[PDB]
Ligand binder design. Structure first.
Ligand SMILES: [Ca+2]
Ligand SMILES: [Ca+2]
Ligand SMILES: [Ca+2]
Ligand SMILES: [Ca+2]
Ligand SMILES: [Ca+2]
Ligand SMILES: [Ca+2]
Lengths: 103, 97, 109
């Protein structure tokens, strides 16, 4: 699976590594795939307008070949959102994650 | 909806904010929803080759998007980028639909 | 088609232009469409973890209108991975590509 994140916060290198590590663990654990199949990207310092403001925000695309659904997506969303809340102070109302179950 | 934009033009902060605001207004009007439903990202200074040159170019992905809206929407964003950045070439893709 | 690349190493403008040009020629030849239809993007300096590590890596999304014939995806994957190997020393084991078969055309201007 891949998680491709974009945020308007300029993230420092240490915080970036922390997020990549935390997201790797969360994606592997919750979908049920080995970490060797999990890729996380963090595009930071990307200007974002959401709801008419440029307050801190993030966008993510989570793509998996199977393994998604109502019993998984809610947990992934909550877990990744909490990582960005703690590490970047991004409110969950300004983080949109799009899930896609790929053929 | 989310519009994820990429351009090889390096864009200054004010022009970026103007584009984000212009695009927010245009998307909101064309889709008929409040701005609280609209996210615009601008990835700038991303090298792009299009039709075998690196002339000014933009690429946009539309996520979580009425019929015909996509064409009027993509053309309007294309016009905004031409006016604000002098980008003469652009491509828009409806993603995950 | 569009190839949107992301890599975690910094890439200088000359190397970037080489990658963009070689990727344009390779995608155009393998897919059979003229270069006028090919767009390549290179997002560099993007932190990536793959298999739990941050060694040089790349992600690519290849978006084609209607998808490609049997075997063509694998040929594209191999060819792009060689470009990234030659130009950036990214091992092919750390290149991850996703193909999108778009059921509707791009909007181009
Ligand atoms: Ca997968
Ligand atoms: Ca389920
Ligand atoms: Ca949205
Ligand atoms: Ca329609
Ligand atoms: Ca095309
Ligand atoms: Ca195509």
């Amino acid at each position: 699976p891949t998680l491709n994140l974009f945020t308007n916060i300029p993230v420092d290198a240490v915080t970036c590594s922390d997020i990549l590590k935390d997201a790797t663990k969360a994606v592997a654990k919750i979908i049920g795939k080995p970490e060797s199949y999990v890729m996380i990207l963090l595009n930071s310092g990307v200007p974002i307008a959401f709801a008419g403001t440029e307050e801190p925000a993030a966008y993510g695309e989570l793509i998996s070949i199977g393994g998604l659904g109502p019993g998984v997506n809610g947990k992934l969303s909550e877990t990744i959102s909490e990582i960005l809340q703690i590490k970047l102070s991004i409110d969950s109302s300004r983080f949109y994650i799009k899930f896609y179950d790929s053929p």
